Amino acid sequence: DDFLAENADIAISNPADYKGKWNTVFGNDNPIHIEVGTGKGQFISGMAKQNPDINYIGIELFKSVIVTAVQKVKDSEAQNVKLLNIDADTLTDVFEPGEVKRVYLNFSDPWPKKRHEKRRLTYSHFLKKYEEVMGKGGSIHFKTDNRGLFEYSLKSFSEYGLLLTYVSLDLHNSNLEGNIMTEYEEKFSALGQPIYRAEVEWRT
């Protein structure tokens, strides 16, 4: 509610208004990379610090957790990060085709039961939404430790016709140049459970 209003510079209260004008909000034409399901915001803050020449937008359905995320963006003074308290279905209300250059998905809600397939952020509907905002010059960068979700996601990507250009089935034992760990990633890393990673892009 009212700590968001106070930090309305980082947390945009009316994101529909900047559809086709996100460059003005950032004051440059640096590529815009979004994250769907930011959570506490460790990943978006690290990536912001690491890549000053990319503009980051985090979207999170819960205000309770997006609050922790604005604090992390306020704490590291990264000026290249904004946060939206919106649902993934409103993405098309907020972005014109080609305005987004890349979509990050990090440890998304698995919804493992068949009947809840359409809640999964890798389901074809959400894939179409990412296409609408990237056109076909986009990519999706996905990591999770959930075996069921990754295996579902691989099938989903394949079914939609996306091209798999990167896949790790044990990310921590793969050569990552500057992979920023998410909150979830740091917990599961200790476990020895493998972290799954895919890059998919639209076929030219």
Next chain:
Amino acid sequence: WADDFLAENADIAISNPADYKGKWNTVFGNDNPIHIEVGTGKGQFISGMAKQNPDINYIGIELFKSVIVTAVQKVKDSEAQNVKLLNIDADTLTDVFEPGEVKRVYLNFSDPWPKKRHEKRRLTYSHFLKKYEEVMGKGGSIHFKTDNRGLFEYSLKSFSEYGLLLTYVSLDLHNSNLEGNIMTEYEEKFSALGQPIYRAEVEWRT
């Protein structure tokens, strides 16, 4: 001594497979689907599958005659009549089968050839994928198990690049509910290691 053993057991190990191209149903005495395995090895998998699925006809191919001898003996030891073995490489598959004659291709713990210059020796590289298409047409599938993370990672990208559809994927087969999974010789060793077994099913887009 391998050549002579194969000669005495020519009923199971077909010495001239090109001669049966388009007529494999006559060799089996039925129109049951023919599933093939490229890289049979010692033949545990194909013997188990034969015995489990008497309504499927199985053909194993193995380049090494050293190991295909062990495979003949396992096929002889289990009196499965729905299995033949060919001592041929994967390139020769088109000389042996007409399009659609093969319904399914099994790949089991194939040589990983990890270095970039050896990509073309990998049984999931686009050239071999083209060969499987030639013998299955576009109503086939490829059933693939391996313990090698590098090879599975590469294979997923290869399948995707060729335009195949991924319809099943397990990243931990032994902790997945698989009904009638037949372990290969290599698979049984790795099952006891906590090492995960990777499985994909991939089919042609229609």
